[PDB]
Amino acid sequence: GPSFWLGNETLKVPLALFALNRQRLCERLRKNPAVQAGSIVVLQGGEETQRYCTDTGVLFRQESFFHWAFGVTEPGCYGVIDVDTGKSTLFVPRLPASHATWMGKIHSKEHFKEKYAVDDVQYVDEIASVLTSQKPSVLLTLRGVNTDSGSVCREASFDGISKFEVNNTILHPEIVECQVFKTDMELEVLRYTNKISSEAHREVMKAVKVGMKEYELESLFEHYCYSRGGMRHSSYTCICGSGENSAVLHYGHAGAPNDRTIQNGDMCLFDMGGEYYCFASDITCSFPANGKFTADQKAVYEAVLRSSRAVMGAMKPGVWWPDMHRLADRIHLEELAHMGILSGSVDAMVQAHLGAVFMPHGLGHFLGIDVHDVGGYPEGVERIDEPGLRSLRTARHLQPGMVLTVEPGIYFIDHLLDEALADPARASFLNREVLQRFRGFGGVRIEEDVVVTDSGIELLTCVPRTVEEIEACMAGCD
Amino acid sequence: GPSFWLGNETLKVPLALFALNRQRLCERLRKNPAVQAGSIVVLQGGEETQRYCTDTGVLFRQESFFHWAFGVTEPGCYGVIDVDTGKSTLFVPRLPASHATWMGKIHSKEHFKEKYAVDDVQYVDEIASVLTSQKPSVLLTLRGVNTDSGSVCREASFDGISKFEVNNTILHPEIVECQVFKTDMELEVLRYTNKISSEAHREVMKAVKVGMKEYELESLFEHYCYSRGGMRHSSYTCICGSGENSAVLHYGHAGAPNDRTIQNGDMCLFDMGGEYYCFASDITCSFPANGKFTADQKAVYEAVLRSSRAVMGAMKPGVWWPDMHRLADRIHLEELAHMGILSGSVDAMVQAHLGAVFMPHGLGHFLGIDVHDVGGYPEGVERIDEPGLRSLRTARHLQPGMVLTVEPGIYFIDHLLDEALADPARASFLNREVLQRFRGFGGVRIEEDVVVTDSGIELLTCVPRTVEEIEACMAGCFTP
Ligand SMILES: CC(C)C[C@H](N)C(=O)O
Ligand SMILES: CC(C)C[C@H](N)C(=O)O
Ligand code: PRO
Ligand code: PRO
Ligand SMILES: [Mn+2]
Ligand SMILES: [Mn+2]
Ligand SMILES: [Mn+2]
Ligand SMILES: [Mn+2]
């Protein structure tokens, strides 16, 4: 069958991937007792946009649910799926003649059918007529709440939909649940995105020099990913935090735009991940700017390396993800105690939630078409109201096929440290004279992408991780 | 005063630039009979956004009117200007403590006042209270229609604005008219954006090899602009058209994403421009993929080069822009005839609008903070209802301070050529035995950025343009 491909050494992605997703979705819906026979899934693709009221086009990136089901790259489409038969129909815009001048070839419906390997293709302006001829019982549309953004996903609409029976409650939980579990074809793409991004991280580590601006490495990373990987988009805005900026978790946005000069003695925390055909990667590398870990830097870094490997070593089906978060917490506290930053009973530290002072984010999250993938908190899965754990993007138990990030970290964040020092229940553990040396240190995060298997996990990421590996890589000439 | 700067060799842009814009706006408004004392201009900045319903942040780029007035890079702000005094107040978001953990330092209001050199800084939630205490006559908000996109620019709104007297008709044409004329400080930035983008185009010409994907050069261009120029954004999606794709004017979008393999014999048309601190550049270079112009390629290319230089040579204050478009049309028709593609009376060809078959777009457009800058069609200025000319983004007369693109091109577009061949009023001019050789040629566009001056123009762009210059550049080796 046909495949998406950007030539050279880029990955060929079979369109069968999306056909399988459609089949899996139909299979799940059929088993839902509330789903009537003759139901049709109706999805609306993303539309082209411009900057504000200007004529400046924004580069189109497909809506995630629509991509998952159809893999369509063109704006302005709809896509439907007959639940009972699994038959798929793509609706494409009927373009004006002038499109041939300004935008490119006006492809036939048959072209799109062959390109996407769907059962039928029609024009968007005929959707009401086509659906009417099928005489559906009900249209299943997509509406629900994303548990990371809090945004409501807006359901499909077209002129004449009001004359149909529409249900907007059933579909969202079901398609979300399908996305949580990656097919072998999906895993092939995620292996690829990790491969390219890992390569790019390596090039960045080799390229870093004292005196460079953070954004120079952002630029290099994205250039490697695009030119060598065909990754026109990143999965998220590159986080290139040097020195104290490595303590800022999502540094790099417009308000803090990777504009610090890298200095001798800085730690770097680079969290960057290219996107290929709307599939994510999410990788963080931490390393000394000058290529040589100091004693303090080595201690903090190896603490996180320890929690990283411990979590990965423990992960397998049935494991409760919050237990992994607490494992990482305990390890960090043990190591910070060994360093002399902390003193006392680690058990008591844990009881006082001291771990969250140093890791004020969740251990990791589902990853897929989105960097923070859907399905972390389905109905019946509750968020844990404790420091650190409340920032977990899922509280589920691990099952085979899930793709998760493993991203423990340790940071020295002033307002969190100050809060702890003011609290008698936590201050007693902190050795102020030692901690003072680590003010402005920033932080370390080690972030891997992994897949849950029947017996454990598969690691997708491949970057240098031990102190020796990192120093060797950075000293590389070629 | 303070300056915007991304270090290394990037441009220091004084915040005085935006102070001058605010002053100029006020000075214009004070002369407007519709403006009464005690008026306050109220602008709303862009807000941060995400992809669809996801948690994936979109990199924030400031709204253009707000940038012109304040130069603010942070999302979620408002800005007001007291017309009578010119006093400026920036409103910044009141951030949650957790911002310190995830996004970074929670800067003080004083930090922002010092950063942007405004007269006062307040929190956004206080805007109603602060404006109330000032006892304005009327709030002047921004609403109008962009004549390129057709979009309505939405006016500022805040909780309690309904308690105020609001006018949304006065401001838009006035701020637009200020934007049309670039200050010396603004020109410094556009010189810079052209410098970096020109350097990047040159690096691309040196690097292009047969067998590469078009997007490899897109990537390289943007990497040069960001890493060397501090240009995090491009001014528009890169157009990297090779072979027949060079006939597609805005090739490179999601539907045609620069994904063709460059072949020996192809012409390349690369239209790319980095953006620095929300100021545009807009440059097109055309060249043979293999670094050697064929005879046919040289002829088409030099035809566009002739019209480019003719227009640039003719441009000066008082010139009517549509006349420059017609000048380009005439030169293209002359040269296509000199090539044997066309035969007959060139005067007759012009009367039949034959030029539009080969250049089905406007000669050029205003440029500034937006690549297609505002103000091309103010009240009174009409769009000419003829092929080609109707696509002009302005029909104004040239005056000093205007910044325009000069981007003639010649393309071989099948459905337009076929229309002409089926039209008795046009068909006889076309020599099929020669034209057939140029089917699938693609096209050539030569795009420069210029400033209208008292004496003519200032050319901002600095790339190789003659056949000799281009072949040298591609060989790794010019005078504008
Ligand atoms: C918005 C972009 C497609 C503009 C294009 N670079 C031009 O010459 O007008
Ligand atoms: C910036 C965020 C959207 C994603 C971030 N890279 C993470 O590890 O979660
Ligand atoms: O957003 C998240 O969940 C991870 C943890 C901190 C960095 N990114
Ligand atoms: O859109 C415009 O006006 C110019 C002319 C063709 C290429 N871009
Ligand atoms: Mn990450
Ligand atoms: Mn992550
Ligand atoms: Mn242009
Ligand atoms: Mn252009």
CATH fold-level name of the largest domain in chain A: Creatine Amidinohydrolase
**Highest CATH level, the class of the largest domain in chain A:** Alpha Beta
> What structural category arises from helix and sheet content of chain A?
alpha+beta
Helix amount of chain A: 25-40%
What is the total number of structural domains of chain A?
2
Greatest interface and its participating residue counts: A-B, 71 and 70 residues
In DSSP terms, counting alpha (H) and pi (I) runs of 4 or more, how many helices of chain A? Answer: 16
Cα-atom radius of gyration of chain A: 24 Å
Q: What fraction of the residues of chain A are assigned to beta strands by DSSP?
A: 15-25%
CATH superfamily of the largest domain in chain A: Creatinase/methionine aminopeptidase superfamily
EC number (chain A): 3.4.13.9
Subunit structure (chain A): Homodimer.
InterPro entries (chain A): Aminopep_P_N, Creatin/AminoP/Spt16_N, Creatinase/aminopeptidase-like, Pept_M24, Peptidase_M24B_aminopep-P_CS, X-Pro_dipept-like
Binding site for Mn(2+) 1 (chain A): 271, 282, 447
